Design an enzyme around this catalytic site. Structure first.
Site: not given
Ligand SMILES: Cc1cn([C@H]2C[C@H](O)[C@@H](COP(=O)(O)OP(=O)(O)OP(=O)(O)O)O2)c(=O)[nH]c1=O
Ligand SMILES: Cc1cn([C@H]2C[C@H](O)[C@@H](COP(=O)(O)OP(=O)(O)OP(=O)(O)O)O2)c(=O)[nH]c1=O
Ligand SMILES: Cc1cn([C@H]2C[C@H](O)[C@@H](COP(=O)(O)OP(=O)(O)OP(=O)(O)O)O2)c(=O)[nH]c1=O
Ligand SMILES: Cc1cn([C@H]2C[C@H](O)[C@@H](COP(=O)(O)OP(=O)(O)OP(=O)(O)O)O2)c(=O)[nH]c1=O
Ligand SMILES: [Zn+2]
Ligand SMILES: [Zn+2]
Ligand SMILES: [Zn+2]
Ligand SMILES: [Zn+2]
Lengths: 160, 160, 167, 174
Positions: C9, C74, C149-150
Site C-alpha cells: 500500500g 518496511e 530513500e528519504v
C-alpha cells in the site's frame, strides 16, 4: 473439513458469478459439486426448500446455493451439511428492498467461516452501490425481477 | 475517475471470472465496456499487443484485459487509459511456472488503485494453492494449455 | 507450512498496523513471534515477542530461526527481502511483510514486488488522499529530493489518489 | 458522504485493531474522529491507547445515544464492541445519513453461535462488511467462532482468553 461461506450483496453485484467462481475452483480439482438455485426465479437443481435436495447433497463434497435468502430452511441445511464435512457456499441478498434482513439469511453469519459483501454499481449516480431499490409500488418482499423492477443504489440514491 | 485494478493469482483461481464479474457490474449500469484477450491463447477482442486495440479502447469507459502477463505493453497501455479516465481491470498470472514475475505485469502494481491475489485449490493435496507447477519438461515460459499441462499447487506440492 | 503474506500500500495506509494485527493473532495463540523493522527508519510512529531493528534481514537470522512467525516492516528497504522470506517460509515459518509497493515516482520500490509470485497472500491497502480525501493508492513526495530513500512521515509525504498525484 | 462499515469476527481476530487502522487513516488526513468503547468492558487489553486519546475523542459509553452530541461534532466515528449497544442500528444509520463515516467492530456471534444482540441488522444497512478470522486456540487452524470455557449461561460475560477461546468448527463442537 466442513464449512459455510456466505456471499452477500445487493442485486447486480455478481454474487452468483462469485458463487460459481468458487465452486469451479473445487470442481477443477475433481471435487464432486452440486449447485442449488431457487426454483421460482426463472430469469444445477431448482428447489423451493433445501430439504428437497438434501439427499442429493449427501453425495457431494461442495454445495453451492444461489439466492439463499429465499430458502426458509437455509440455516438448518447449511449447518447440517457443513457439520457432515461439506463445503457450503451461499450467494444471497443481505437486504430486501427495505434494507431489512432478507429472510433467515443473516442467521448464517455467526455460523459461517467466511462472509463477504460485494458491491454493485449505482444505476442512478454510478458510484459504488450496497443496496437494492424497488422501482414500483409492490409492498410484498418476494417480487421476482431484474433491472426493470430494481436498481442497485448507493445510500444517497436509495433515499432520493 | 480513471483507475487500474489488478487481479492476480495462479492458474485455475478464476481470475477471468472475477474480471468478468467486475466488468459486468459496469455493463449492467450502462457503461460502454471492452474486453481484450490474448490472441494466442485459444483453448471480446483478441490481441497480441494492446496498442492494436487502443482505438477501440479510447471509445469505451471500462476496459478489461485477460491474461495481461502476455502483453508486452501492458504498463504503458493501462497507465495511459487510466490517465484518460478509463477503468482498466486486468487479470493476470503473477508468476510463471518458475515462480518468477510473468512479463511486465508486476510493474502495474505501483500504478494500481486495487490489487488482489486470488487462490486456487491445490490439485495435489487440496489445500489452498498460490502457484502454478508445469507438469512437463518444457523450459520456455509461454506454453499454452490447461490442467493437462499445469497444476495449481501450494508451496509444499510445488517443491514435490 | 511455511508461507509469505505481503501487505502492500502507499504511506498512511496502516500497513504496519495490519502487520501487527496478523502477528498478534498468532501470538495470542502461543506462537513464538519476531518482528523486524528497518533500522534506518527511526520515526516514532514506526516504533516499537522479540522486536528487532535491522538493515539486512540476515543480521537477525539467528533470532528468526528460533520463531514460528516473522513480521517484517518496511520490506522494501531490505536488500535481502526476497531471499530471506523465501528461505524462512521454506523452513516452515509464516512470514508477514508490510511494504510500500511504490516509490514517490510510482516505480517498484527495490525488490519488493519479486515477493508477489512467491507469496500465498498479497493485499494492497488504501490510504485517504490528503489533498482531496477520496481513496489514495500512491505516495507523493512534498520536497525536491531526488534519491529514493528519504525517511519521513506526513511532514515529507502525502498519500494521494491518481488525480492529486499528477497535480 | 456518509457510510457504515462493519468489521465482524470472533474474539481474538483483531477487530478493534482493524477499526483503529481504519480510523487512523482518516485522522492522519485531518478528519475529526471519535472512537466509542463499551464502558462495561473494563479489560486492560480493551482500553484506549495513549496516542489515540491525544489525537481523537475516545469515550466509554453504554448507550450510543449518550454520546450523540459528541458524535455530531465529528466526521468519523468508530465503535468498538458494537454488539453491546442496544441502539447500534439507530445510531449508525442516523450518523451515516447525516454524512458521517461510521466504522463498527463487533462480534457477529455469541458463544452459542447465535446473532449477538442487534448487530446483524447493520449488515443490510452497511456499505462494507468483512468477517475477520482468528487462530483456533485448540488446533491452530483458522477460527471463525468463540467458545466459552465456563458454564455461565448469560450472553454477556466480559472476559478474555481466560474465559473464551477462538475456535474452528471442529473444536467448537469438542
Ligand atoms: C431486493 C429484492 C430482490 N428480489 C428478487 C429479485 C430477484 O428476482 C432476486 C435477486 O436475487 P439475487 O440473489 O440478487 O440473484 P443472483 O444470485 O442472480 O444475484 P447476482 O445478480 O448478484 O449474481 O431477488 C426480491 O424478490 N425482493 C427484494 O426485495
Ligand atoms: C504458469 C504458466 C502459465 N502459462 C500459460 C498457461 C495458460 O495458457 C495461461 C494461463 O491462463 P490463465 O487464465 O492464467 O489460466 P486459467 O484459465 O486457469 O486462469 P483462471 O482460472 O485463473 O482464470 O498461461 C504459461 O505460458 N507459462 C507459465 O509459466
Ligand atoms: C514513498 C517513499 C517513502 N519513503 C520512506 C518514507 C518512510 O520513512 C518510509 C515509509 O514507511 P511506511 O511504514 O510505509 O510509512 P507509514 O508509517 O506512513 O505507513 P503505514 O501507515 O502504512 O504503516 O519510506 C522513502 O524513503 N522513499 C519513498 O519513495
Ligand atoms: C463471545 C462472547 C464475548 N463476550 C464478551 C467478551 C468480551 O468482553 C467482549 C468481546 O470483546 P472483543 O473485542 O470482541 O474481543 P477481543 O478483545 O478478543 O477482540 P479482537 O481481538 O477481535 O479485537 O464480549 C460476551 O459477553 N459474550 C460472548 O458470547
Ligand atoms: Zn447513487
Ligand atoms: Zn498441495
Ligand atoms: Zn486526491
Ligand atoms: Zn480447531
Amino acid at each position: 473439513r466442513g464449512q459455510i461461506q456466505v456471499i452477500l450483496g445487493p442485486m447486480f453485484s455478481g454474487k452468483s458469478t462469485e458463487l460459481m467462481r468458487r465452486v469451479r475452483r473445487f470442481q477443477i480439482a475433481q471435487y464432486k459439486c452440486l449447485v442449488i438455485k431457487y426454483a421460482k426465479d426463472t430469469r444445477a437443481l431448482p428447489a423451493c426448500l433445501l430439504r428437497d435436495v438434501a439427499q442429493e447433497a449427501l453425495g457431494v463434497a461442495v454445495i453451492g446455493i444461489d439466492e439463499g435468502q429465499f430458502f426458509p430452511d437455509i440455516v438448518e441445511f447449511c449447518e447440517a451439511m457443513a457439520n457432515a464435512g461439506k463445503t457450503v457456499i451461499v450467494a444471497a441478498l443481505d437486504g430486501t428492498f427495505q434494507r431489512k434482513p432478507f429472510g433467515a439469511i443473516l442467521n448464517l453469519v455467526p455460523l459461517a467461516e467466511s462472509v463477504v459483501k460485494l458491491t454493485a454499481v449505482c444505476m442512478e449516480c454510478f458510484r459504488e452501490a450496497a443496496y437494492t431499490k424497488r422501482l414500483g409500488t409492490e409492498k410484498e418482499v418476494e417480487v421476482i425481477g431484474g433491472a426493470d423492477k430494481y436498481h442497485s443504489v448507493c445510500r444517497l440514491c436509495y433515499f432520493k
